[model samples]
Target chain A: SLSIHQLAAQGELDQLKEHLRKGDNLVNKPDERGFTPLIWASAFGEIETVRFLLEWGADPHILAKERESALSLASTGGYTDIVGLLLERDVDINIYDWNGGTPLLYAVRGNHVKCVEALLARGADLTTEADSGYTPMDLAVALGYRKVQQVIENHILKLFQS
Target chain B: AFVHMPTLPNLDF
Candidate 1:
């Protein structure tokens, strides 16, 4: 009774591939929780599954009924490679979930240095504040995520340089 | 025994 989504989340490459080729709702299907295969795969850091799903025509831009996205899930797990891959699809880098967290905010909150760096490099808006009324920089400062602060400061400094 | 910094996740593939 393994759904294609479960195969995707579990990183069952051969099974996922077979399911996608001959299964129902294999690509854009969302679970009862509204999470799609892409979101679950990204959440679990299943990089190969993510890549395979993307190649198999999974929609990267679909948000769950709760507004969960592949980007946000990947960010929450600090999966920088997955985050970067989603970013390449013209996905909204500043999407805030029901939890009031944007990908950048989640990355900072998790103290994920590479995730934060990738987000900044992609020009994620620093001005987008979460429902907590804290912007990415503000949250980083409040949480005493010094490395996050340094990366933000450095990005800003680079913007002002020259 | 060397203490590995926990900043990065276990990358064991």
Candidate 2:
């Protein structure tokens, strides 16, 4: 029997909903690692499950034991849509996890072009350094993500003009 | 108008 958090992680929507029916508190309950159902759904790129949990009052602002936010995990996994959804809730865009990786840094490390663009468009700090002392652009350049580099360059141009 | 861009280390292959 999968717990509600496990069901959410595996995208078992019906089963997750059944568990939540027992009580709304189940929607936001954190596991041993402090990961809520919403965090698991976001981490796994389960957009429908994420949406359902949000609608049922799941907190997008919840941080897990390692300061892992739904936004950070979503960006880490290149879940662009999930990133957008979490962004719409106005979660901390520059939130750094215990490992010192922000959403933008994770996106850059993963070569997630769209996720990087989305984060920049939402005013994510471009200068945040990871535990490795690598900024988003530094990580992109180090990883040879040419497309992401171009996107960051374009954003710089836009910033100058605006 | 001058725009000061941060310099990146050259990655010569």
Candidate 3:
């Protein structure tokens, strides 16, 4: 049988909606990992599901037990649209997990240019340091992610230009 | 679960 968590992980919108309407509290219910449907949907790059969950009042601010957030999860997966959706709702852009890595750091590590761009455009703090002592740009350089480093450099250049 | 950062004890920062 499909559960609410499965429905979310699988991006089963129709069935998930049915469960939501049935008083399942599907929007904010966390799995055993303390990850909500929104986070699950975000991790899988399910843009439509993310949108629907937010419209249905899924709390983008709900962090997992270890402080994982929808924004960080979506950014880590290189899902720019999902990142934008969560950003639109004003979730903490620089939220760090147990490792002290923020969405910007994860986006850089993933070599996701658009995700890095999206996060920078939303004013993600570039100064946050991971437990590894690597800031977003530092991680990009360490990981040999030229495009990610370029994106950060360009954003910084734009800041000075303005 | 939180996204675990792989610990790199050998990684010199």
Candidate 4:
């Protein structure tokens, strides 16, 4: 039950606190797949729970079970709100996750405009190459997400101006 | 005390 308790799937902060008091580290304890509480909460878009854990000392810099961080997981899930929250916590936006994708790359691929905006503001590496050497923006374009593709393109285009 | 600046969440727009 320790592992299940640590999952915090329901995101009951009260329950999390109770578990922590019972000696659960509530920090970077990873699951079978290496997911920590922060990773789980972020992936599920559990914003309130994420705040609770971060307030209690969950490491924003902690990577996930897949060599990723909570920030990347949130981005891939298209949870822009949480992405912004993570950025405010000073999460490393350029961290290369499981497959060398930055949160900026995830935002574009996920078509989460706000997430892309957040990562852009945080200075994520927008030029990371996809598997085929296509840029993240290229992947968005390949998928026909024109609006998302345009944002990345615009950022790239404007980078030369400023 | 929490600084708690509520996000505008696009307040400018």
Candidate 5:
């Protein structure tokens, strides 16, 4: 079976380490669901847990069974700090998952406005939304992320005049 | 466990 969980889903660092040292050190260990400790932490938006894990030497870029990583999971909550930390670690912002989605696209889907900004600032490709066939604006609209929608709309308008 | 942040080692700033 798989092992590990998202950082947010994990409890405190001390507790996490307790488990880590006791066989959890296989930080990247995948669970039956194919999720890792980092994925769980990021998905639940647990900044401290995520930070603690990252500091513990986990692989920020390890893809889950679904091909998602901590960075991708974190984008769902616009966890800017996590994303920044991941980026600083050189994690791939656009790594795709099983559904053919990238964390950048997920950021738009989840209305993670700040995360979107941070990703773009970190050199994420604005045009890579290509394969999903869903522009950033489309993701914002689909999720009722008006503020994010507006920003994306303006960005598109300036870039293509459409 | 924490990650070594492969990003820091190659940074130029």
Candidate 6:
């Protein structure tokens, strides 16, 4: 008996739809960890599941118990497309977890070049500091992510131009 | 103006 959250995490869209039909309130229900189906789907990079949950009225704004956001988790996993999908909902692009890890910082930390680029283009704050006091650029440099550093540098140039 | 350190100093953790 998989919960809706678990089903979403596993990309079990058919089974998930069956469970959702049983209760209208199931779509946005949080598990023990305060993760909604949408959060689980986004975190697991289940694009179609994420889309289904969103279409079914799942709130992307919901944060987990520790303030883990769908966007943050997606960025951490280097799921650039998921990040883009969440961003289209106008969720807080700069949303931070309990550890002060913003999506941008997480993307930078993981050397997720496209995620970083997507986030930055959407106005993700480069100035946000993590619990370790590392900004996005700082973390990119610390991790020796040359491509991410290059992207950030290009973003800075764009900022300067406008 | 957006300003940051032009060069990241080489530091080891």
Record all residue pairs in model 3 with backbone atoms less than 3 Å apart, i.e. clashing.
none
What's model 2's TM-score? 0.89
lDDT score for residue A51 of model 2: 92
- Model 4: how far residue A81 lies from native, Å: 1.5
Interface RMSD for candidate 6 relative to the native interface:
15.4
Among the numbered candidates, top lDDT falls to 2
Which pairs clash (backbone N, Cα, C closer than 3 Å) in model 1? none
Displacement of residue A93 (Cα, Å) in model 3 is 0.4
Better of 2 and 5 by lDDT: 2
**Residue A126 of model 6, lDDT score:** 82
Residues A58-114, candidate 1: write the lDDT tens digits: 999998877888898888788999998898898999987777778898888888999
Q: Judging by TM-score against the true structure, name the best candidate.
A: 6
Task: At residue A108, give the lDDT of candidate 6.
Answer: 77
For residue A146, give model 1's deviation from the true position in Å. 0.8
lDDT of 5 by residue, A18-133 (tens): 67787835887777756667777777667788787788877777776557578877786677888887898888777766565677787776667888878877867666653547
Model 2 CA lDDT for position A121: 96
Docking class of 4: incorrect
- Give chain B TM-scores in order: 0.28, 0.31, 0.29, 0.28, 0.15, 0.25
Off by over 4 Å in 4: A1-7, B1-13
Lowest-sum lDDT 10-residue window in model 2 chain A: A20-29
lDDT of 6 by residue, A96-147 (tens): 6766678888777667799999999999888878777778888878888999
What TM-score does each of the candidates earn?
A: 0.89, 0.89, 0.89, 0.79, 0.74, 0.90
Error of 4 at A64 (Å): 3.2
lDDT score of model 4? 0.68
The sequence of per-residue lDDT tens digits that candidate 2 reaches over residues A68-135 is: 78888888788899998998999999997766678888888777899999999999988878777778
Query: What local lDDT does model 6 show for residue A75?
Result: 85
lDDT of 3 by residue, A90-142 (tens): 88998877756888887777678998999999999888888888788888888
